[PDB]
Write an enzyme that holds these catalytic residues in place. Structure first.
Site, PDB file in Angstrom:
ATOM      1  N   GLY A  76       0.840  -1.191   0.000  1.00 47.94           N
ATOM      2  CA  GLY A  76       0.000   0.000   0.000  1.00 47.94           C
ATOM      3  C   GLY A  76       0.879   1.246   0.000  1.00 47.94           C
ATOM      4  O   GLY A  76       2.083   1.169   0.260  1.00 47.94           O
ATOM      5  N   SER A  77       0.285   2.394  -0.306  1.00 50.00           N
ATOM      6  CA  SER A  77       0.952   3.682  -0.120  1.00 50.00           C
ATOM      7  C   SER A  77       0.327   4.371   1.088  1.00 50.00           C
ATOM      8  O   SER A  77      -0.794   4.022   1.479  1.00 50.00           O
ATOM      9  CB  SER A  77       0.782   4.518  -1.359  1.00 50.00           C
ATOM     10  OG  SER A  77      -0.601   4.591  -1.660  1.00 50.00           O
ATOM     11  N   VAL A  78       1.051   5.327   1.675  1.00 51.45           N
ATOM     12  CA  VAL A  78       0.675   5.926   2.945  1.00 51.45           C
ATOM     13  C   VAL A  78       0.621   7.447   2.765  1.00 51.45           C
ATOM     14  O   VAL A  78       1.451   8.010   2.102  1.00 51.45           O
ATOM     15  CB  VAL A  78       1.657   5.518   4.089  1.00 51.45           C
ATOM     16  CG1 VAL A  78       1.299   6.158   5.427  1.00 51.45           C
ATOM     17  CG2 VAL A  78       1.662   4.019   4.303  1.00 51.45           C
ATOM     18  N   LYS A  89      -3.160   4.342   5.321  1.00 52.98           N
ATOM     19  CA  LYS A  89      -2.637   3.365   4.373  1.00 52.98           C
ATOM     20  C   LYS A  89      -3.728   2.879   3.425  1.00 52.98           C
ATOM     21  O   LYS A  89      -4.735   2.292   3.837  1.00 52.98           O
ATOM     22  CB  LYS A  89      -2.021   2.173   5.086  1.00 52.98           C
ATOM     23  CG  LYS A  89      -1.028   1.446   4.198  1.00 52.98           C
ATOM     24  CD  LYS A  89      -1.047  -0.064   4.298  1.00 52.98           C
ATOM     25  CE  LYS A  89       0.025  -0.577   5.248  1.00 52.98           C
ATOM     26  NZ  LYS A  89       0.030  -2.060   5.516  1.00 52.98           N
ATOM     27  N   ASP A 101       4.146  -3.475   9.523  1.00 55.23           N
ATOM     28  CA  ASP A 101       3.913  -4.479   8.479  1.00 55.23           C
ATOM     29  C   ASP A 101       4.459  -5.846   8.772  1.00 55.23           C
ATOM     30  O   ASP A 101       4.808  -6.586   7.875  1.00 55.23           O
ATOM     31  CB  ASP A 101       4.412  -3.969   7.126  1.00 55.23           C
ATOM     32  CG  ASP A 101       3.600  -2.779   6.640  1.00 55.23           C
ATOM     33  OD1 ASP A 101       2.510  -2.467   7.235  1.00 55.23           O
ATOM     34  OD2 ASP A 101       4.058  -2.168   5.652  1.00 55.23           O
TER      35      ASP A 101
HETATM   36  O1  LIG Z   1       5.474  12.151   8.183  1.00 55.18           O
HETATM   37  C1  LIG Z   1       6.309  11.652   7.419  1.00 55.18           C
HETATM   38  N1  LIG Z   1       6.793  12.462   6.423  1.00 55.18           N
HETATM   39  C2  LIG Z   1       7.705  12.157   5.259  1.00 55.18           C
HETATM   40  C3  LIG Z   1       7.920  13.017   4.562  1.00 55.18           C
HETATM   41  N2  LIG Z   1       7.053  14.232   4.571  1.00 55.18           N
HETATM   42  C4  LIG Z   1       6.389  14.411   3.251  1.00 55.18           C
HETATM   43  C5  LIG Z   1       5.452  15.610   3.273  1.00 55.18           C
HETATM   44  O2  LIG Z   1       6.166  16.802   3.606  1.00 55.18           O
HETATM   45  C6  LIG Z   1       6.934  16.714   4.836  1.00 55.18           C
HETATM   46  C7  LIG Z   1       7.830  15.462   4.840  1.00 55.18           C
HETATM   47  C8  LIG Z   1       6.573  10.239   7.502  1.00 55.18           C
HETATM   48  C9  LIG Z   1       7.662   9.563   6.934  1.00 55.18           C
HETATM   49  C10 LIG Z   1       7.800   8.176   7.069  1.00 55.18           C
HETATM   50  C11 LIG Z   1       6.874   7.402   7.790  1.00 55.18           C
HETATM   51  C12 LIG Z   1       5.777   7.990   8.369  1.00 55.18           C
HETATM   52  C13 LIG Z   1       5.651   9.393   8.223  1.00 55.18           C
HETATM   53  C14 LIG Z   1       4.790   7.277   9.119  1.00 55.18           C
HETATM   54  O3  LIG Z   1       4.359   7.788  10.170  1.00 55.18           O
HETATM   55  C15 LIG Z   1       4.269   6.021   8.746  1.00 55.18           C
HETATM   56  C16 LIG Z   1       3.131   5.638   9.483  1.00 55.18           C
HETATM   57  C17 LIG Z   1       2.475   4.419   9.247  1.00 55.18           C
HETATM   58  C18 LIG Z   1       2.918   3.558   8.235  1.00 55.18           C
HETATM   59  N3  LIG Z   1       2.348   2.376   7.890  1.00 55.18           N
HETATM   60  C19 LIG Z   1       1.145   1.859   8.270  1.00 55.18           C
HETATM   61  C20 LIG Z   1       1.129   0.502   8.558  1.00 55.18           C
HETATM   62  C21 LIG Z   1      -0.030  -0.149   8.966  1.00 55.18           C
HETATM   63  N4  LIG Z   1      -0.141  -1.485   9.280  1.00 55.18           N
HETATM   64  C22 LIG Z   1       0.850  -2.187   9.928  1.00 55.18           C
HETATM   65  O4  LIG Z   1       1.952  -1.717  10.259  1.00 55.18           O
HETATM   66  C23 LIG Z   1       0.646  -3.517  10.173  1.00 55.18           C
HETATM   67  C24 LIG Z   1      -0.050  -4.413   9.432  1.00 55.18           C
HETATM   68  C25 LIG Z   1      -0.071  -5.666   9.891  1.00 55.18           C
HETATM   69  C26 LIG Z   1       0.625  -5.848  11.025  1.00 55.18           C
HETATM   70  S1  LIG Z   1       1.326  -4.338  11.502  1.00 55.18           S
HETATM   71  C27 LIG Z   1      -1.212   0.605   9.012  1.00 55.18           C
HETATM   72  F1  LIG Z   1      -2.440   0.001   9.406  1.00 55.18           F
HETATM   73  C28 LIG Z   1      -1.221   1.963   8.685  1.00 55.18           C
HETATM   74  C29 LIG Z   1      -0.064   2.597   8.301  1.00 55.18           C
HETATM   75  F2  LIG Z   1      -0.165   3.787   8.058  1.00 55.18           F
HETATM   76  C30 LIG Z   1       4.061   3.956   7.506  1.00 55.18           C
HETATM   77  C31 LIG Z   1       4.749   5.162   7.763  1.00 55.18           C
HETATM   78  C32 LIG Z   1       5.894   5.351   6.947  1.00 55.18           C
HETATM   79  C33 LIG Z   1       7.079   5.994   7.799  1.00 55.18           C
END
Ligand SMILES: O=C(NCCN1CCOCC1)c1ccc2c(c1)C(=O)c1ccc(Nc3cc(NC(=O)c4cccs4)c(F)cc3F)cc1CC2
Length: 332
Positions: A30-32, A47, A162
């Site tokens: 997925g993208s976030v 996500k 993840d």
């Molecule tokens: O705020 C961030 N900014 C980056 C760059 N910005 C760009 C815009 O301008 C300013 C700078 C940033 C940079 C990197 C990251 C996050 C945020 C983050 O909080 C973040 C938050 C959540 C996420 N993944 C995510 C995973 C999951 N699921 C799971 O982790 C799981 C699934 C199954 C078991 S655990 C989910 F449900 C929802 C999600 F959003 C992935 C990230 C990626 C890491």
């Protein structure tokens, strides 16, 4: 039922409740997008699952993800604030969105290729191991643990992203396509990360599979001929690398805390039968300032019998749908 709005971000369509404002991409399955939730006043990550029910593997993974997130509750595991879909009904259900607290960085964005101090590392790796202990105690593995899977906030609080869903951090047994993996595949990854935060450099930055294997085999303790027996003519190409005179392992990390260096040697062992586990790594002298067994929980028993079902896309889809419908947000 909320009102949705559409928009195209990075060539993909996001359709979300109006409560989620200022969608802004932050970079799997997925993208976030970072966003501001006007109903709770929290900054959030949203996500969008990519093509969640367009293959059996995806459908089952989508369900797995929703099940895992409704089951786990842990400081080092991301907490589901909302799950939603534009779909008005089951026949219309084709996209899933998961909301969590915005963390704001992954671990590469913290280590911009600079050594971290020893306390900073203890705290970072401590939390990773604490999270893994919990995760492992549910008979779940990460399998692709790397810095881009570790979200970190301004106070250095860390979340393992993840996990449970599935090359520089990958255990050798996995890239050799062994069949019998244990949970220590993630401890290998922990070592690689840990090493990297001590030195500023990636420990094994292989440009390909063979390079990667060689960078590892030549630096890391060579097993007994016993273990090279548990493996075509690969045994020869492997044996040819491992038989060669090695450098002292600790010399790679000169000036590091010697307890750190000791824990690394217990983690970066080839024989997964002799790798330290998460729980054992937490009780290493390295973590004396942080270790507290009354605050390193294990997971509730988790029903994974769905893993041994083989279903069709629409069955996996229905079960996920029921999980979306019955989701209840945490209070706060
Ligand atoms: O705020 C961030 N900014 C980056 C760059 N910005 C760009 C815009 O301008 C300013 C700078 C940033 C940079 C990197 C990251 C996050 C945020 C983050 O909080 C973040 C938050 C959540 C996420 N993944 C995510 C995973 C999951 N699921 C799971 O982790 C799981 C699934 C199954 C078991 S655990 C989910 F449900 C929802 C999600 F959003 C992935 C990230 C990626 C890491």
């Amino acid at each position: 039922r909320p009102t949705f709005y559409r928009q195209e971000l990075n060539k993909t369509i996001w359709e979300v409740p109006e409560r989620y404002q200022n969608l802004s991409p932050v970079g799997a399955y997925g993208s976030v997008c970072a966003a501001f939730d006007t109903k709770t006043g929290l900054r959030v990550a949203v996500k969008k699952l990519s093509r969640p029910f367009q293959s059996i593997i995806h459908a089952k993974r989508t369900y797995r993800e929703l099940r895992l997130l409704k089951h786990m509750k842990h400081e080092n595991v991301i907490g589901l604030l909302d799950v939603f879909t534009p779909a008005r009904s089951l026949e219309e259900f084709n996209d899933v969105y998961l909301v969590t607290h915005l963390m704001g960085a992954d671990l590469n964005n913290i280590v911009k290729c600079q050594k971290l101090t020893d306390d900073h590392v203890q705290f970072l790796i401590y939390q990773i191991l604490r999270g893994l202990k919990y995760i492992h105690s549910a008979d779940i593995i990460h399998r692709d643990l790397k810095p881009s899977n570790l979200a970190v906030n301004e106070d250095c609080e860390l979340k393992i992203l993840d996990f449970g869903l599935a090359r520089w951090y990958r255990a050798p047994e996995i890239m050799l396509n062994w069949m019998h993996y244990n949970q220590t595949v993630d401890i290998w990854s922990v070592g690689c990360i840990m090493a990297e935060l001590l030195t500023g450099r990636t420990l094994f930055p292989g440009t390909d599979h063979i390079d990667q294997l060689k960078l590892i085999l030549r630096l890391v303790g060579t097993p007994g001929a016993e273990l090279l027996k548990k493996i075509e003519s690969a045994r020869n190409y492997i044996q040819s690398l491992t038989q060669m005179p090695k450098m002292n392992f600790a010399n790679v990390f000169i000036g590091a805390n010697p307890l750190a260096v000791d824990l690394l040697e217990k983690m970066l062992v080839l024989d997964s039968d002799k790798r330290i586990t998460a729980a054992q790594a937490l009780a290493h002298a390295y973590f004396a300032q942080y270790h507290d067994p009354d605050d390193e929980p294990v997971a509730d028993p988790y029903d994974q019998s769905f893993e041994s079902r083989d279903l069709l896309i629409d069955e996996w889809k229905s079960l996920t749908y029921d999980e979306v419908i019955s989701f209840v947000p945490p209070p706060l």
